[PDB]
Amino acid sequence: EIESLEQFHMATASSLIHKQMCSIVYTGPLKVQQMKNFIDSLVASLSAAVSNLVKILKDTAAIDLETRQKFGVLDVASKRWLVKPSAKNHAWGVVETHARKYHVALLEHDEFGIITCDNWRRVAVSSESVVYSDMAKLRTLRRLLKDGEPHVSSAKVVLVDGVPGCGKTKEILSRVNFEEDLILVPGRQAAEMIRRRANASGIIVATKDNVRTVDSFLMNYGKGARCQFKRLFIDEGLMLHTGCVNFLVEMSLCDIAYVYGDTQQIPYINRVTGFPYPAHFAKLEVDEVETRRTTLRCPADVTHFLNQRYEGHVMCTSSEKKSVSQEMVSGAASINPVSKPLKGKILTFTQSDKEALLSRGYADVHTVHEVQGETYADVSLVRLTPTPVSIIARDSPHVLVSLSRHTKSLKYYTVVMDPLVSIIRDLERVSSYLLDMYKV
């Protein structure tokens, strides 16, 4: 397989496409199987992206659309988009030559647009080809394999399992030794905020060398120096493929790694269609589990709810007691920012409901999953789907996350009676003295 980014350029599209690898057999201990599966998830992801771009060009002689799409098709002769894409400056795409051959192309980009070659007939791009991160990660990871086998680290792995608002990032910031350790986190904005918080005094201790995103670490590995970090701290580590974590522990050359997360919140979601990510693969294999049971964010009534989901006596430092309420609504058609202003951060459980509210004129709406890890003073939670919604259950991680974002209040607006209404109704009746007992 290709092990150099440059090699992806002009590679035949078919060479990167693989038949639904839903029939992959893995060998070796769990960590090795997880690492192999992670690489395969990337191969599958890239395969689907390339395959769809080829299909766009090959399924029909031509394709022209009037409405903007997630994909785009460029007519080379005129340099006009026959199918207009929602994104710009895509890192790569699939090229159709006049001889009707299909190759992947790392697109250069400025003139009046994409730089094309003489034998190019059409260029297809999509939201999946905006960046070539999968390609960069694959080339990095493949170089770490010896005959398809990865090396598992002997480092001790400690899971710091904490409740919502226990202050996981604050702990990392207090525990880390910036001169010897490395901190990794998924988002770019997330990494930047870790550095800003660390450097609040004005003294720079956190740099782009010791606090980075997971993608950056993987994509540029060995580009310069190969540093041996004493300890590795992975914020939001449970939101990554377990195979990815195993690789990070190994690649950092650490003696110990601390993975920060909450096993009751929303874990990594396998978004690769037709690709298996079994339950035994989904469980991160760690050596020790540290627990944090005090929330520095949630009111006492929410803490009462949390206490039913975690053993170990969940406590809160906040003086807020009651904070939840709920009411029925007929549907999106009956509400709008004017007639029904919604206080604070507006959240929905699904993308569909989110779109429905945005369509009503509400601004800055996000799904519960999208705001995992975030804190708000007031929350307006909305359920517009009347039919069954799996993720809305008494013991659902989504429900737990939806109730633990606020510090002041939360109001649930729903079109139908459901488990969350029951939860809120019960919390409203919990003994005031019982709520007093959670404060620490």
Coordinates of C-alpha atoms in Angstrom, one line a residue:
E1 CA 0.0 0.0 0.0
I2 CA 1.0 3.6 -0.6
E3 CA 3.3 4.9 2.2
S4 CA 4.0 8.5 0.9
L5 CA 1.5 11.3 0.5
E6 CA 3.0 12.3 -2.8
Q7 CA 2.4 8.8 -4.1
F8 CA -1.4 9.3 -3.8
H9 CA -1.2 11.9 -6.5
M10 CA -2.2 10.4 -9.9
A11 CA -2.7 7.0 -8.2
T12 CA -5.4 5.1 -10.1
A13 CA -8.8 5.6 -8.4
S14 CA -9.4 1.8 -8.4
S15 CA -6.2 1.1 -6.5
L16 CA -7.7 2.9 -3.5
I17 CA -11.1 1.3 -3.7
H18 CA -11.8 -1.9 -1.7
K19 CA -14.8 -4.1 -1.6
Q20 CA -16.7 -3.7 1.6
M21 CA -14.1 -5.1 4.0
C22 CA -17.0 -6.2 6.3
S23 CA -15.3 -9.6 6.2
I24 CA -11.9 -8.8 7.8
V25 CA -10.4 -11.4 10.2
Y26 CA -8.0 -10.1 12.7
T27 CA -5.3 -11.9 14.6
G28 CA -3.2 -11.0 17.7
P29 CA -4.0 -9.6 21.1
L30 CA -6.8 -7.1 21.6
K31 CA -4.7 -4.0 21.3
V32 CA -3.1 -5.2 18.1
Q33 CA -6.5 -6.1 16.6
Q34 CA -7.8 -2.6 17.5
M35 CA -4.7 -1.0 15.9
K36 CA -5.2 -3.1 12.7
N37 CA -8.9 -2.2 12.7
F38 CA -8.1 1.5 13.1
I39 CA -5.9 1.4 10.0
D40 CA -8.6 -0.5 8.2
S41 CA -11.2 2.0 9.2
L42 CA -9.1 4.7 7.5
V43 CA -8.7 2.5 4.3
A44 CA -12.4 2.0 4.2
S45 CA -13.1 5.7 4.7
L46 CA -10.8 6.7 1.9
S47 CA -12.2 3.9 -0.3
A48 CA -15.7 5.2 0.1
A49 CA -14.7 8.8 -0.7
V50 CA -12.8 7.7 -3.8
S51 CA -15.5 5.3 -4.9
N52 CA -18.2 7.9 -4.7
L53 CA -16.2 10.4 -6.7
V54 CA -15.7 7.8 -9.4
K55 CA -19.4 6.9 -9.4
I56 CA -20.3 10.6 -9.8
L57 CA -18.3 10.6 -13.1
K58 CA -18.9 7.1 -14.3
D59 CA -22.5 6.1 -13.5
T60 CA -23.8 8.6 -16.2
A61 CA -22.2 10.2 -19.2
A62 CA -22.7 13.6 -17.7
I63 CA -24.3 15.2 -14.6
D64 CA -25.5 18.8 -14.2
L65 CA -27.4 20.2 -11.3
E66 CA -28.9 23.6 -10.4
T67 CA -28.8 23.4 -6.6
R68 CA -25.6 23.4 -4.6
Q69 CA -24.5 19.9 -3.4
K70 CA -21.9 18.4 -1.1
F71 CA -20.1 17.2 -4.2
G72 CA -18.9 19.1 -7.2
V73 CA -18.0 18.4 -10.9
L74 CA -15.8 20.7 -12.8
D75 CA -15.8 20.9 -16.6
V76 CA -12.1 21.3 -17.5
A77 CA -12.6 22.9 -20.9
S78 CA -14.5 25.8 -19.5
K79 CA -13.5 25.6 -15.9
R80 CA -17.1 25.9 -14.8
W81 CA -18.8 23.8 -12.1
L82 CA -21.5 21.6 -13.7
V83 CA -22.4 20.6 -10.2
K84 CA -21.7 23.3 -7.6
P85 CA -20.0 22.2 -4.3
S86 CA -20.6 23.6 -0.9
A87 CA -16.9 23.8 -0.1
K88 CA -13.9 25.4 -1.8
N89 CA -10.2 24.7 -2.4
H90 CA -10.6 20.9 -1.9
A91 CA -7.3 19.2 -1.1
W92 CA -8.0 16.4 -3.6
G93 CA -10.5 14.9 -6.0
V94 CA -10.8 12.4 -8.8
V95 CA -9.8 13.3 -12.3
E96 CA -11.3 11.9 -15.5
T97 CA -8.9 12.1 -18.4
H98 CA -10.0 12.3 -22.0
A99 CA -9.0 8.7 -22.4
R100 CA -11.5 8.2 -19.7
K101 CA -9.1 7.0 -17.0
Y102 CA -9.7 7.9 -13.4
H103 CA -6.9 9.0 -11.0
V104 CA -6.8 10.6 -7.6
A105 CA -5.2 14.1 -7.8
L106 CA -3.7 16.2 -5.0
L107 CA -5.1 19.5 -6.3
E108 CA -2.9 22.6 -6.5
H109 CA -5.1 25.7 -6.6
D110 CA -4.6 29.3 -7.7
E111 CA -5.1 31.0 -11.0
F112 CA -8.8 31.6 -11.4
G113 CA -9.2 28.2 -9.7
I114 CA -7.8 24.7 -9.8
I115 CA -4.7 24.1 -12.0
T116 CA -5.6 21.5 -14.6
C117 CA -3.6 19.4 -17.1
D118 CA -4.2 19.0 -20.8
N119 CA -5.6 15.5 -20.7
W120 CA -8.1 16.4 -17.9
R121 CA -11.8 16.2 -18.9
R122 CA -13.5 16.5 -15.6
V123 CA -12.7 16.8 -11.9
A124 CA -15.0 15.6 -9.1
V125 CA -14.7 16.7 -5.5
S126 CA -16.8 16.3 -2.3
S127 CA -17.1 17.1 1.4
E128 CA -15.0 14.0 1.9
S129 CA -12.2 15.3 -0.3
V130 CA -11.9 18.7 1.3
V131 CA -8.8 17.5 3.2
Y132 CA -6.4 14.5 2.7
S133 CA -6.1 13.7 6.3
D134 CA -7.0 10.0 5.9
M135 CA -4.2 9.7 3.3
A136 CA -1.7 11.4 5.6
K137 CA -2.6 9.3 8.6
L138 CA -2.5 6.1 6.5
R139 CA 1.0 6.8 5.2
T140 CA 2.2 7.6 8.7
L141 CA 0.6 4.4 10.3
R142 CA 1.7 2.1 7.5
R143 CA 5.3 3.0 8.1
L144 CA 4.8 1.8 11.7
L145 CA 3.9 -1.7 10.6
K146 CA 6.3 -4.6 10.2
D147 CA 4.7 -7.1 7.8
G148 CA 1.3 -5.7 8.7
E149 CA 2.0 -5.9 12.4
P150 CA 2.0 -3.0 14.8
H151 CA 4.1 -2.6 18.0
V152 CA 2.1 -2.4 21.3
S153 CA 3.5 -0.1 23.9
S154 CA 4.5 -1.4 27.4
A155 CA 3.5 1.9 28.9
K156 CA 0.9 1.8 31.7
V157 CA -2.4 3.2 30.6
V158 CA -4.6 4.9 33.2
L159 CA -8.2 5.9 32.4
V160 CA -9.4 8.9 34.5
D161 CA -13.1 8.2 34.4
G162 CA -14.9 11.4 35.6
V163 CA -18.5 12.8 35.9
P164 CA -19.7 15.8 33.8
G165 CA -17.9 19.0 34.9
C166 CA -15.5 17.2 37.2
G167 CA -12.9 19.4 35.4
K168 CA -10.9 16.9 33.3
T169 CA -9.0 19.6 31.3
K170 CA -8.2 21.5 34.5
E171 CA -6.8 18.3 36.0
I172 CA -4.6 17.7 32.9
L173 CA -3.4 21.3 33.2
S174 CA -2.4 20.8 36.8
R175 CA -0.9 17.3 36.4
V176 CA 1.2 17.8 33.3
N177 CA 4.9 18.6 33.3
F178 CA 5.2 20.7 30.2
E179 CA 9.0 20.2 30.0
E180 CA 8.6 16.4 29.6
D181 CA 5.1 15.5 28.6
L182 CA 2.7 15.7 25.7
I183 CA -1.0 16.6 25.6
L184 CA -3.2 15.5 22.7
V185 CA -6.9 16.3 22.0
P186 CA -9.1 15.9 19.0
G187 CA -10.1 19.5 18.0
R188 CA -7.9 22.4 16.9
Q189 CA -10.0 24.8 18.9
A190 CA -9.8 22.4 21.9
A191 CA -6.0 22.3 21.7
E192 CA -5.7 26.0 21.4
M193 CA -7.9 26.6 24.5
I194 CA -5.7 24.1 26.5
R195 CA -2.7 26.2 25.6
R196 CA -4.4 29.5 26.3
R197 CA -5.5 28.3 29.7
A198 CA -2.0 26.9 30.4
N199 CA -0.3 30.1 29.4
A200 CA -2.8 32.5 31.1
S201 CA 0.0 33.8 33.4
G202 CA 1.8 35.1 30.4
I203 CA 4.6 32.6 30.8
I204 CA 4.6 30.3 27.8
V205 CA 4.7 26.7 29.0
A206 CA 2.3 25.2 26.4
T207 CA 3.4 25.2 22.7
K208 CA 2.3 23.5 19.5
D209 CA 5.0 21.0 20.3
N210 CA 3.6 19.7 23.6
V211 CA -0.1 20.4 23.2
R212 CA -1.4 19.3 19.8
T213 CA -4.4 17.8 18.0
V214 CA -4.5 14.0 17.4
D215 CA -4.6 14.6 13.6
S216 CA -1.6 16.9 13.6
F217 CA 0.4 14.4 15.7
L218 CA -0.4 11.6 13.3
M219 CA -0.1 13.4 10.0
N220 CA 3.2 15.0 10.7
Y221 CA 4.8 12.2 12.7
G222 CA 8.6 12.0 12.3
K223 CA 8.4 15.0 10.0
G224 CA 11.1 16.6 12.2
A225 CA 12.3 15.1 15.5
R226 CA 10.9 12.0 17.1
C227 CA 10.5 13.0 20.7
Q228 CA 10.2 10.7 23.6
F229 CA 7.7 12.1 26.1
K230 CA 7.7 10.9 29.6
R231 CA 3.9 11.0 30.0
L232 CA 1.0 11.3 27.6
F233 CA -2.3 13.0 28.4
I234 CA -5.2 12.4 26.0
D235 CA -8.1 14.7 26.6
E236 CA -11.4 13.3 25.2
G237 CA -9.6 10.0 24.6
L238 CA -12.8 7.9 24.7
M239 CA -14.0 9.8 21.6
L240 CA -11.3 8.2 19.5
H241 CA -11.1 4.7 17.9
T242 CA -9.4 2.5 20.5
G243 CA -6.9 1.5 17.9
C244 CA -6.0 5.2 17.6
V245 CA -5.3 5.6 21.3
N246 CA -3.1 2.5 21.3
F247 CA -1.0 4.1 18.5
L248 CA -0.8 7.4 20.2
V249 CA 0.5 5.7 23.4
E250 CA 3.1 3.9 21.4
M251 CA 4.1 6.8 19.1
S252 CA 4.6 9.2 22.0
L253 CA 7.1 6.8 23.5
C254 CA 5.6 7.6 26.9
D255 CA 6.1 5.4 30.0
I256 CA 2.6 6.2 31.1
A257 CA -0.5 7.6 29.5
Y258 CA -3.6 9.1 31.1
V259 CA -6.8 9.0 29.0
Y260 CA -9.4 11.4 30.3
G261 CA -13.1 10.7 29.7
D262 CA -16.5 9.6 31.1
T263 CA -17.7 6.1 30.3
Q264 CA -21.3 7.2 30.7
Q265 CA -21.1 9.9 28.1
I266 CA -21.1 9.5 24.3
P267 CA -18.2 7.5 23.1
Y268 CA -16.5 7.3 19.7
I269 CA -19.0 6.7 16.9
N270 CA -18.0 4.6 13.9
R271 CA -19.1 6.7 11.0
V272 CA -17.8 4.4 8.3
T273 CA -20.7 2.8 6.4
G274 CA -20.6 -1.0 6.2
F275 CA -17.5 -1.1 8.4
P276 CA -17.6 -3.2 11.5
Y277 CA -16.4 -1.8 14.9
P278 CA -17.5 -4.6 17.3
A279 CA -18.2 -4.1 21.0
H280 CA -15.0 -5.9 22.2
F281 CA -13.0 -3.6 19.9
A282 CA -14.9 -0.5 21.2
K283 CA -13.7 -1.0 24.8
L284 CA -10.5 0.7 25.5
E285 CA -8.1 -1.7 27.2
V286 CA -6.5 0.1 30.2
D287 CA -4.4 -1.0 33.2
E288 CA -5.9 1.2 35.9
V289 CA -9.1 3.3 36.3
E290 CA -9.1 6.5 38.4
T291 CA -12.5 7.9 39.3
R292 CA -13.6 11.5 39.7
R293 CA -17.0 11.9 41.3
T294 CA -17.4 15.6 42.1
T295 CA -18.9 17.9 39.5
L296 CA -17.8 21.5 39.6
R297 CA -20.5 22.5 37.2
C298 CA -23.9 20.8 37.7
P299 CA -26.7 21.9 40.1
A300 CA -27.8 19.6 42.9
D301 CA -30.8 18.2 41.2
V302 CA -28.7 17.2 38.1
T303 CA -26.2 15.7 40.6
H304 CA -29.0 13.6 42.1
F305 CA -29.6 12.2 38.6
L306 CA -25.9 11.6 38.0
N307 CA -25.7 9.8 41.4
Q308 CA -28.1 7.2 39.9
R309 CA -25.8 6.6 36.9
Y310 CA -22.4 6.4 38.7
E311 CA -21.5 4.5 41.9
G312 CA -19.0 6.2 44.2
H313 CA -21.3 9.0 45.5
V314 CA -21.5 11.9 43.1
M315 CA -21.2 15.3 44.7
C316 CA -21.4 18.9 43.5
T317 CA -19.7 22.1 44.6
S318 CA -22.4 24.4 43.1
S319 CA -24.9 26.0 45.4
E320 CA -27.6 25.7 42.7
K321 CA -30.4 23.3 43.8
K322 CA -33.4 23.0 41.4
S323 CA -32.7 23.8 37.8
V324 CA -34.9 21.7 35.5
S325 CA -38.4 22.1 34.0
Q326 CA -40.3 21.0 31.0
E327 CA -43.3 21.6 28.8
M328 CA -45.1 20.2 25.8
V329 CA -45.1 21.9 22.3
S330 CA -47.1 21.0 19.2
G331 CA -44.1 21.1 16.8
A332 CA -41.7 23.4 15.0
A333 CA -44.5 24.9 13.0
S334 CA -46.0 26.5 16.2
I335 CA -42.8 28.2 17.3
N336 CA -40.3 30.8 16.2
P337 CA -37.8 33.3 17.9
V338 CA -40.5 36.0 18.1
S339 CA -43.5 34.1 19.5
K340 CA -41.4 31.6 21.4
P341 CA -38.0 33.0 22.3
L342 CA -35.8 30.2 23.7
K343 CA -33.4 31.2 26.5
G344 CA -29.7 30.4 26.4
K345 CA -28.1 27.6 24.3
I346 CA -30.7 25.9 22.1
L347 CA -30.0 22.1 21.7
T348 CA -31.7 19.2 20.0
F349 CA -30.9 15.5 20.2
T350 CA -30.9 14.9 16.4
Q351 CA -29.6 16.7 13.3
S352 CA -33.1 16.6 11.9
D353 CA -34.6 18.5 14.8
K354 CA -31.7 20.9 14.7
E355 CA -32.4 21.6 11.0
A356 CA -36.1 22.1 11.8
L357 CA -35.4 24.8 14.4
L358 CA -32.9 26.6 12.3
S359 CA -35.6 26.5 9.6
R360 CA -37.8 28.3 12.1
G361 CA -35.4 31.2 12.5
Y362 CA -33.6 30.1 15.7
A363 CA -29.9 30.8 15.7
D364 CA -26.9 28.9 16.9
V365 CA -28.6 25.6 17.4
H366 CA -26.6 22.4 18.0
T367 CA -27.1 18.8 18.8
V368 CA -26.4 17.3 22.2
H369 CA -23.5 15.3 20.8
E370 CA -22.0 18.4 19.1
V371 CA -21.8 20.2 22.5
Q372 CA -20.3 17.4 24.5
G373 CA -17.7 18.9 26.8
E374 CA -19.3 22.4 26.7
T375 CA -20.8 24.4 29.5
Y376 CA -23.7 26.9 29.4
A377 CA -25.6 28.9 32.0
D378 CA -29.0 28.2 30.5
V379 CA -30.2 25.5 28.1
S380 CA -33.3 25.1 26.0
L381 CA -33.5 21.5 25.0
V382 CA -36.0 20.7 22.2
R383 CA -37.5 17.4 20.9
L384 CA -39.5 17.8 17.7
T385 CA -39.6 14.2 16.5
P386 CA -42.9 12.6 17.8
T387 CA -41.9 9.1 16.8
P388 CA -39.4 6.9 18.7
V389 CA -35.9 8.2 19.0
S390 CA -33.5 5.6 20.3
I391 CA -30.9 8.0 21.8
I392 CA -33.6 9.5 24.0
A393 CA -33.8 6.9 26.8
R394 CA -33.6 6.9 30.6
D395 CA -30.1 5.3 30.4
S396 CA -28.9 6.9 27.2
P397 CA -25.5 8.7 27.2
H398 CA -27.2 11.4 25.1
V399 CA -29.7 12.1 27.9
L400 CA -27.0 12.2 30.5
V401 CA -25.0 14.7 28.4
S402 CA -28.2 16.8 27.7
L403 CA -28.8 17.3 31.4
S404 CA -25.3 18.1 32.4
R405 CA -24.4 21.1 30.3
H406 CA -26.0 23.9 32.4
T407 CA -25.0 25.7 35.5
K408 CA -28.2 27.7 36.0
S409 CA -31.2 26.2 34.2
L410 CA -32.5 23.8 31.6
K411 CA -36.0 23.6 30.1
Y412 CA -37.1 20.6 28.0
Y413 CA -39.6 21.4 25.2
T414 CA -41.0 18.3 23.7
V415 CA -43.8 17.2 21.3
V416 CA -44.2 14.0 23.1
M417 CA -44.1 12.3 26.6
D418 CA -40.8 10.4 26.9
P419 CA -38.3 9.1 29.5
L420 CA -36.7 12.6 29.9
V421 CA -40.0 14.1 30.9
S422 CA -40.2 11.5 33.6
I423 CA -36.7 12.2 34.8
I424 CA -37.3 16.0 35.0
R425 CA -40.7 15.4 36.8
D426 CA -39.0 13.3 39.4
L427 CA -36.1 15.7 39.9
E428 CA -38.6 18.5 40.5
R429 CA -40.0 16.5 43.4
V430 CA -36.8 15.2 45.0
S431 CA -36.4 16.1 48.7
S432 CA -34.7 19.5 49.2
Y433 CA -32.7 18.0 52.0
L434 CA -31.5 15.2 49.8
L435 CA -30.3 17.9 47.4
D436 CA -28.5 19.6 50.2
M437 CA -26.5 16.5 50.9
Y438 CA -24.8 16.5 47.5
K439 CA -23.0 19.8 48.2
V440 CA -19.2 19.5 49.0

